[PDB]
């Protein structure tokens, strides 16, 4: 009776793709932005991935440039990085490009290297998290990316047929995303007889229960 | 995680006395009484992803005329047997339903569709119908809980989740058993653990992070 799928099909067909001013090729986003530089969880400490005391040994070495070396093989690459910063040795862009990008403490090797050597910041930008790069100018892809929340990023990474970021609608046609503003979204939604909302926040989910702190 | 939500939920769960639950259900018992495909809400909808489009159309036309071109896909053999049988008016026993895939390509069950043509058999075939095709169960029964749960809770149950909410009750898994607790016990223990809670927001058709509904 409600015919939601036909209504969504009508809604997507009402947009003027060719005349959108802003559009992005998905395959280019993929090539320019490795996924781990987009997802917000990369910015947090990576405790689920390494043994705690090996991380403890690595942090102490980072902070004092002396201490017992961690033995674990998971630590080899972060240890290479930590020794280089202690010893003042250079790391080529090729090193960052063949690394896992993400430092155990959260954020990127490239970003931490360039906090020590700002002369290399521009050169190392393609290996930094989008949340580590400078605030981008209005209208640019980096701008939209930096101001997407976690749900919008995930939809983007997943190639979703549409998603909402900020007040913008992103609509996938073929392998391109076309952007439309809030007012166009509403008018076409109304013409298809539809209402919409962005997915509600759920901080920790267990079954169908959304948990939060009382305060 | 400055809020330590996982450790608060661990506290929360530890506050319940499972002996004092309002009632309890064994997961193995649910599994025996309700084959999963009779629980899931998507079994009630057209099975478009499970068959090729041309064969569904041939099969639909076959059902309405009892003649014409047969769909030939190997997936469609059993639905075709069912379709022929309603056409020719031959009888299907409970044994045939029990040994079938249960779900008709157009949505719903073989048993329900058989019973629409032969209503005298409705009661006898209820164990092979979807829970949304059976009459509403009486208050206090498992089937009543299942019919009134909602989709997300059904999915939580079929996925064996650690806990979920149905209506106002809390279902808490302990081992292989679900224990039900009332909203006042739920709220008290959440309050002791420094936790607030809500059920997942309604989202009838999700595309990306967009939740769609009809403007009524």
Structure description:
The structure is a homodimer. With 215 residues, chain A is an alpha+beta fold. Chain A has 2 domains: 1-44 and 129-215, no CATH class; 45-128, no CATH class. In chain A, 39% of the residues lie in helices and 14% in strands. Chain A contains 10 helices and 7 strands. In chain A, the strands form 2 sheets. Chain A has a 4-stranded antiparallel sheet with strand order 1-4-3-2. Chain A has a two-stranded antiparallel sheet with strand order 6-7. In chain A, strand 2 (162-165) and strand 3 form a beta hairpin. The longest helix of chain A is centred in the N-terminal third of the chain and has 13 residues, at 52-64. Chain A is elongated and about 70 Å long. The two termini of chain A are 43 Å apart. The interface between A and B is large, with 39 and 40 residues. Strand 5 of chain A pairs antiparallel with strand 7 (210-214) of chain B, so a sheet runs across the interface. The PDB classes it as signaling protein. Keywords: VxrA, Two-component system, Histidine Kinase, Sensor domain, Structural Genomics, Center for Structural Genomics of Infectious Diseases, csgid, signaling protein. The assembly is dimeric. THE STRUCTURE OF A SENSOR DOMAIN OF A HISTIDINE KINASE (VxrA) FROM VIBRIO CHOLERAE O1 BIOVAR ELTOR STR. N16961, D238-T240 deletion mutant.
